[PDB]
From a paper:
The sigma-1 receptor (σ1R) is a non-opioid transmembrane receptor which has been implicated in many diseases, including neurodegenerative disorders and cancer. The sigma-1 receptor (σ1R) is a small, unique integral membrane receptor that is localized primarily in the endoplasmic reticulum (ER). σ1R responds to a structurally diverse array of synthetic ligands such as (+)-pentazocine (agonist) and haloperidol (antagonist). Published structures of human σ1R reveal its homotrimeric organization of a cupin-fold β-barrel body that contains the ligand binding site, a carboxy-terminal V-shaped two-helix bundle, and a single amino-terminal transmembrane helix, while simulation studies have suggested a ligand entry pathway that is generated by conformational rearrangements of the cupin-fold domain. Here, we present multiple crystal structures, including an open-like conformation, of σ1R from [name]. Together with functional binding analysis our data suggest that access to the σ1R ligand binding site is likely achieved by protein conformational changes that involve the carboxy-terminal two-helix bundle, rather than structural changes in the cupin-fold domain.
To further validate the structural integrity of the cysteine mutants of xlσ1R, we solved a structure for the xlσ1R-C179/C203 double mutant (xlσ1RC179/C203-[name], 3.80 Å) to ensure that the folding of xlσ1R was not disrupted by the cysteine mutation(s). The xlσ1RC179/C203-[name] structure was solved in the P21 space group, with 24 protomers in each asymmetric unit. The same homotrimeric organization was observed in xlσ1RC179/C203-[name], which resembles closely other xlσ1R structures. The α4/α5 region of xlσ1RC179/C203-[name] appeared also similar to the closed and the open-like conformations. The xlσ1RC179/C203-[name] crystals were grown in the presence of PRE084, and [name] was later soaked in after the crystals had formed. Each protomer of the xlσ1RC179/C203-[name] structure contained one [name] molecule in the ligand-binding pocket, which adopts a similar pose to the ligand in the xlσ1Rclosed-[name] structure. As expected, no disulfide bond was formed between Cys179 and Cys203 in this structure, thus allowing [name] access to and binding in the ligand-binding site. This result indicates that substitution of the residues 179 and 203 with cysteine did not perturb the structural integrity of xlσ1R, and the resulting xlσ1R mutants retained the ligand-binding activity. However, interestingly, in one of the 24 protomers of the xlσ1RC179/C203-[name] structure, an extra electron density resembling the shape of [name] was observed near the ligand entrance in addition to the [name] molecule in the ligand-binding site. The density was readily and best modeled with an [name] molecule.
Author numbering:
A (entry chain E): 12 to 217
B (entry chain A): 5 to 217
C (entry chain C): 4 to 217
Write the structure that this text describes.
């Protein structure tokens, strides 16, 4: 099993290393930084329009968009899932309250471009934290674990790469053992299923 | 489409119709406006004096329904990522009245349950973030917030927030959320014992009052 | 009055507690809360990085063979009771532990109710403590020393730069259940759990090796 799971990780990491992707972290970061310094609602709408223009058939429609609460690692915010597959996902994340906690250690590289508010990150193994402002882009690398903190008006555009199904375990831990808000769990499963079916339908049409 | 699960769906539906029918026709003791007004009368005063005056008024207008001072104690409450303390004045299978608040800065998930809850802030601040929005509102002493049935919001409190809270609905379902952090995070089973203790005392007081009538 | 196994299990657990509590009175610990408190208060009001180094040097001087070496030191995240910080474990046994705790973010939550008396001397930042059964909290500043007694439960809150020297006495294995609750049911950071078990095992083996050499 030692060589078994090692070869399995060789196969999975080889697929992630050779898989023609749709998005890239630089693309979403530039598109978000162009609209940084504006109202986060205007930035959200313009970014959604640009994403559907440059990537048709990959972003959910306005009818299928909804703010879903996200409780994880001790912080609470809300997300609007724009795209999601087995290796990529794009969403609009943020909170209207002061929260913070564990960022989560998962098999996925995540990039967050702050549109408004503040982002305090406390990296592992240090005794000092850094504060990031609108326009900045933060890269949560694979296997990294940090402490995150957000202000009462933080909103950002987030893109994640890697083995996405592994990350959902962390995204639903507090919803199971703390909030017990199973309706929010249903909303998350619903919008994720819609994004997966949209990506599957787009693959079928091609 | 026919299956035994269709009967389970209709069975839960008729079970809900029966339970919601009981909740819709059950002569209650308190009402949210009564508790809200009594708490708003004492807003702008020292919250300890307000607590005492509210307890005296509740025991005057509703004898045999509020616990005595011997059975009152501040119990910590950890739920949804926030932490506060409660003083349970009355509790039944459909209603409960308590004095809630925190002396530290906490916040998190308000909880989605089968109960309508009303909180009248005596002192401090209350930040509420409703579901599906991108902006939150801040409520000040005197305000009254109604957390409706099935609603889920994000709450945040200051380092000196204190309020009088009244809840209506299917109370036993809500206790699962009130003890989640106490089981999987704090593991402070002594606080769990205190919560079960004051809950049992309030239920037995209400049962004894019904027996005397 | 047919207690049967019930009246005996109650008395059995009572005898076990008297056995353990007698052992804690006859264990003749190495450190004491006043010793660690003074050593931390001497360097309060200075940079917490400099204070950490001087306290580690003083601890290794006055108690050789009881503090981990620099090779075995690493900052490990600590998630418990709803708050998140970091620790640097200097010494740990079955009845004592010494570490440098603190956080660089604003956190707070349940202090945890366990079978151990804990003393924290703040080097920098602020410490808000909310005792059970009260409606007001107190704020402690660098130089102060807070004693979380056995069986006590308070609400803790720390600022974005709070750092302290902490010493714990009592039945240490019971406390690890609370220290790893959020890491299991909230963070799911199994690598941090591995780090915690790693540094804890190193401290236990160091103390065992020092006892064997004596
Ligand atoms: C995996 C995951 C982590 C997370 O946390 C908030 C994002 N950021 C994380 C790091 O920095 C702070 C905020 N949400 N989320 C998620 C939740 C639900 C999802 C549903 C479908 C697809 C991806 C889905 C992804
Ligand atoms: C069900 C429940 C929710 C809760 O949360 C704090 C209240 N508020 C909620 C919304 O707004 C913020 C604060 N406590 N609680 C509870 C806990 C223990 C109880 C024991 C006996 C009777 C009712 C008992 C009720
Ligand atoms: C049991 C425990 C609680 C805790 O919390 C931080 C300490 N303080 C608590 C009260 O005041 C605020 C901070 N860490 N910790 C721990 C974690 C890992 C340990 C490993 C080995 C030995 C003791 C070990 C002890």
């Amino acid at each position: 099993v030692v060589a078994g799971l090692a070869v399995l990780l060789q196969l999975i990491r080889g697929w992630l290393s050779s898989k023609s992707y749709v998005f890239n972290r630089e693309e979403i970061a530039r598109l978000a930084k162009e609209h940084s310094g504006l109202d986060y609602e205007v930035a959200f709408s313009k970014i959604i329009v640009e994403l559907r223009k440059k990537h048709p058939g990959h972003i959910l429609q306005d009818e299928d968009l909804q703010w879903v609460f996200v409780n994880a690692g001790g912080w609470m915010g809300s997300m609007c899932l724009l795209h999601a597959s087995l290796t990529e996902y794009v969403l609009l994340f943020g909170t209207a309250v002061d929260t913070g906690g564990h960022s989560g250690r998962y098999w996925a590289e995540i990039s967050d471009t702050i549109l408004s508010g503040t982002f305090r990150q406390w990296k592992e193994g240090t005794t000092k934290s850094e504060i990031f402002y609108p326009g900045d882009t933060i890269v949560h690398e694979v296997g990294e674990a940090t402490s995150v903190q957000w202000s009462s008006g933080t909103w950002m555009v987030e893109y994640g790469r890697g083995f996405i199904p592994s990350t959902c375990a962390f995204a639903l831990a507090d919803t199971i053992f703390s909030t017990q808000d199973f309706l929010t769990l249903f909303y998350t499963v619903k919008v994720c299923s819609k994004a997966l079916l949209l990506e599957a339908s787009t693959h079928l049409s091609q």
